[PDB]
Amino acid sequence: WIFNTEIFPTVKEKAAILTKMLAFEIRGEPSLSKLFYEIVLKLFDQEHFNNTEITVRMEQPFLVGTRVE
């Protein structure tokens, strides 16, 4: 979903569906959370001075991602 451009009309729906994936470490699933923080890290990889993300990826899962043991 995230890593391509299409007629999906806004990126806030991608943001709201990806921000829900912070329950993987709360419920106790390490592998799904590892994949999720890998794709958040890849979203921050292909950006130097860019907004290929939306700015809520810099807000919640980046900051929780600096804590993930």
From Swiss-Prot:
Compartments, as annotated in UniProt: Nucleus
Range of residues in the leader sequence: none
Miscellaneous notes: Although strongly related to the PI3/PI4-kinase family, it lacks the typical motifs that constitute the catalytic site of PI3/PI4-kinase proteins, suggesting that it may lack such activity.
UniProt family annotation: Belongs to the PI3/PI4-kinase family. TRA1 subfamily.
Entry text on domains: The C-terminal domain (2233-2836) is essential for its ability to interact with activators.
Role of this protein: Essential scaffold subunit of the transcription coactivator SAGA complex. SAGA acts as a general cofactor required for essentially all RNA polymerase II transcription. At the promoters, SAGA is required for transcription pre-initiation complex (PIC) recruitment. It influences RNA polymerase II transcriptional activity through different activities such as TBP interaction (via core/TAF module) and promoter selectivity, interaction with transcription activators (via Tra1/SPT module), and chromatin modification through histone acetylation (via HAT module) and deubiquitination (via DUB module).
Oligomeric form and interacting partners: Component of the 1.8 MDa SAGA (Spt-Ada-Gcn5 acetyltransferase) complex, which is composed of 19 subunits TRA1, SPT7, TAF5, NGG1/ADA3, SGF73, SPT20/ADA5, SPT8, TAF12, TAF6, HFI1/ADA1, UBP8, GCN5, ADA2, SPT3, SGF29, TAF10, TAF9, SGF11 and SUS1.
The name this protein goes by in its record: SAGA complex/NuA4 acetyltransferase complex subunit TRA1
Native organism: Saccharomyces cerevisiae (strain ATCC 204508 / S288c)
Designated gene of the protein: TRA1
Residues of the full protein shown: 2359 to 2427 of 3744
